[PDB]
Ligand binder design. Sequence first.
Ligand code: ANP
Ligand code: BIT
Ligand code: MG
Length: 706
Amino acid sequence: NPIHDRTSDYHKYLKVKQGDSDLFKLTVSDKRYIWYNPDPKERDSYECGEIVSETSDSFTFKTVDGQDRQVKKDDANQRNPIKFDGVEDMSELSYLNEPAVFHNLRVRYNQDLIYTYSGLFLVAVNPFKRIPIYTQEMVDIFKGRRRNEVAPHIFAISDVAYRSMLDDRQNQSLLITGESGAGKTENTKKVIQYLASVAGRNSGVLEQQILQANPILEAFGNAKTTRNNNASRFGKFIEIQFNSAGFISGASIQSYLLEKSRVVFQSETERNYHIFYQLLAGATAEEKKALHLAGPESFNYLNQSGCVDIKGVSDSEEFKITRQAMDIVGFSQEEQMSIFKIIAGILHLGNIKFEKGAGEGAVLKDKTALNAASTVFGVNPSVLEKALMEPRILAGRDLVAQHLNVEKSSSSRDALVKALYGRLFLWLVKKINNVLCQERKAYFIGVLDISGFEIFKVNSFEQLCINYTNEKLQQFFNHHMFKLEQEEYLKEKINWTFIDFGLDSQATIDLIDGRQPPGILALLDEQSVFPNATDNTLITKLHSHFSKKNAKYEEPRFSKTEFGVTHYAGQVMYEIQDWLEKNKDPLQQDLELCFKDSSDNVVTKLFNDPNIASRAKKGANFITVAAQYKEQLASLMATLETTNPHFVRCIIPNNKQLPAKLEDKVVLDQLRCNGVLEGIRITRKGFPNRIIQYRFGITKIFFRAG
Ligand SMILES: Nc1ncnc2c1ncn2[C@@H]1O[C@H](COP(=O)(O)OP(=O)(O)NP(=O)(O)O)[C@@H](O)[C@H]1O
Ligand SMILES: Cc1ccc2c(c1)C(=O)[C@]1(O)CCN(c3ccccc3)C1=N2
Ligand SMILES: [Mg+2]
């Protein structure tokens, strides 16, 4: 049994190494220790001091450099006896304080033990290197094991959810939180791997298709940002579906709004979506001539950020892997070829250069890029040129050809690019779901992988929606861990004094999405239909409603175009430029009419299939992106409320994507804003189990521990 064999790989990579006689000596020491700050300006930098004396209310301890200091017992962060260092479940610690919890994660992380329980939920600290704990042999070890029978692991919480699903006949979710780069997408994939394996299984083709969906989604929906070389730029909820017997019967991917803006613009050092680099690196021979391709430096949409490759990644090899996944999932050769024509066409569109005509209207003097795009998309270049520079609109009921200047023509060309790419992405997910989901499900385990909290030098509308999604997820953790839990204790009247755990994201949520008094998204929508609005009237309206009024909002003194939201994970300043256009998300109807006539069978579907190309109305206006965002988030939250949730908190070790480098302030900020210590305390002080060290409740008896 590998669990008990100290030579096994399980022991070697998932268990705390045996300590030596010198460590034994230290472990039976009668000395006692304290975690203190050498510099009180930096509360997160701790050293260990020996406690050398005490009074009824203070400790005196030695500092690393010697000099003795005193501290009130009520302010003291005592160090755990060292037999606790490496403990698998931190609810076992005697002293529950910040430096002690960090220390335990630190000891485990120093020996590549990245998973640790923190009471009821799992903490996963990103190793930023490969650790061989996800093999089939590891999978087989965890299969069917109760949590306290095996070491902490993403496989274990996955098995727990799978047995709860069987035993309780109840849908489950696995909610994996974390800032950008923390490990959500990798851990998501391990949960899927594990479930596909243990739920069977000779009848392996579906399981393979499920796994192969990922390189396709990542190639199109992930990109290098400053926070993650493989940042997810869309959120997803993956439903792994099981028949009533408990075997996997299918899967279905719910994808959320994609950051289409990245197709046309990337900040310094970032990349566009991986697929563009994969194509240009990995085509073939006649693909490059058939698609009129050259290198990334030759395309405006890839030559701006100064970064065309990612250390340790071969875009040409990844292209082979993406195509191989497209084959396995079932995309035809003609379908793959049309997918790449659309990628190539986008890049050609981005190389159109509009310039000033005799008058204010733009003209196109060099049509090389226009012609190449039109060739690959299968559209008429003269019709496309006219739809870009001279689109027709109604003015009242009259039909009037506009003549757009350079800036507007360029923006319209970008709008067409973003629509093509976002619609292609939706089409990819739809095609995948049609393959993966071929049976009605009895049960599901849903795994949520959102885009993680992020802060850049410039934060725009996309960042506010990403960070709001993260705030809402933290609140769902707070609701589950603290608020519902104490609501039960009351509904049962069990002698329980309510405890304020001081974690409540409600104020920030009402600021962003309040109705009600109206929050930020509601005012954005109101401005979006006001004929006379500008990004400046919008910011003025926000300040008017919130400045010196809402405690989570800040009107900054250093800028007239930004506002601050105090999120659970820190304040973010948001630049208002282009918000009304991003929210309206316009696309000239003459461009749509041009692409509806495409000779290409995939392009034609992107523009004629209503599930892909149609947009809902609200009154006399198309539904705004903020409204679409809210519908998606509301649908997710409604789904989660039907499941029994399991939480995995991914923690990034530093801001440099490096292994073996824990950064104290970075880690501790996450431990605080994630509510990890509060989560351990409720576990310890509360009454985790109730049917039908104790309380007799009105209709159940509640159990502690044990
Ligand atoms: N358990 C792991 N083993 C090995 N490498 C990992 C692990 N978890 C994370 N990584 C590395 O860390 C990188 C970022 O992790 P990822 O799971 O993509 O982050 P994320 O939380 O999904 N970020 P985002 O999509 O931007 O919100 C990965 O590409 C891997 O290099
Ligand atoms: C549950 C949910 C709902 C909406 C979402 C997300 C998740 C995301 O993670 C994103 O898919 C990440 C990008 N993003 C987005 C992009 C542009 C505009 C608004 C949101 C997101 N919206
Ligand atoms: Mg991700």
